Amino acid sequence: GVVAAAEKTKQGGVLYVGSKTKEGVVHGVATVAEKTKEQVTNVGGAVVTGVTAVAQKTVEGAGSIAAATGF
Amino acid sequence: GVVAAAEKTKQGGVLYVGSKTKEGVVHGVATVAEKTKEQVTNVGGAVVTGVTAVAQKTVEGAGSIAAATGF
């Protein structure tokens, strides 16, 4: 069936961000529906979201997503 | 100067409105500014405002508006 497996076996830079916004509306991962059966959202990584969203070295590993929606 | 005068000396229909809206956003008389000196709004009549705004025989009289904005 639906199987997810992730293995991480580890045997063994200036970033300046400046923002100045008077008004800001930010939407990240958004799923919108009126009539649906399944609305599954799977997050294995990063969904860093904001007016000044900064992501630095977020997803650096074994990630597995298995979805069997429907049937 | 600024003078307003109104005199009303009175010496002596089926209206069916049906509305069906799932979502409604209604704005009537709206004045929007970021930097202004005067923002005067004068109402002598009717500003009937709504999702199902109905006006029937509203302004039937002597109405006077005198505005001396500025100078």
Author numbering:
A (entry chain B), B (entry chain A): 14 to 25, 36 to 94
List sentences from the manuscript.
In cryo-EM micrographs, WT aSyn fibrils appeared well dispersed facilitating their structural analysis. Two-dimensional (2D) class averaging showed the twisted morphology of these fibrils and revealed two populations of different width. Further 2D classification demonstrated that wide fibrils consisted of two protofilaments (2PF), while narrow fibrils contained only one (1PF). Interestingly, subsequent 3D classification suggested a different fold in 1PF vs 2PF fibrils. 3D reconstruction was successful only for the 2PF polymorph, converging to a map of 2·7 Å resolution, which allowed building an atomic model. This revealed a fold previously observed in recombinant WT aSyn fibrils, where the interface between the protofilaments spans residues 45 to 59 and is stabilized by a salt bridge between lysine 45 (K45) and glutamic acid 57 (E57). In contrast, lateral association of WT fibrils was minimal, and two protofilament fibrils were also abundant. In G14R fibrils, an N-terminal stretch encompassing residues 13 to 20 binds the K45-E57 interface, thereby preventing the formation of the 2PF fibrils observed in WT. Although 3D reconstruction of WT 1 PF fibrils was not successful (see above), comparison of 3D classes between G14R and WT 1 PF fibrils revealed their similarity. Altogether, these data suggest that while WT aSyn is highly polymorphic resulting in at least two stable conformations (1PF, 2PF), the G14R mutation strongly favors the 1PF fold, possibly by blocking the K45-E57 protofilament interface by an N-terminal stretch.
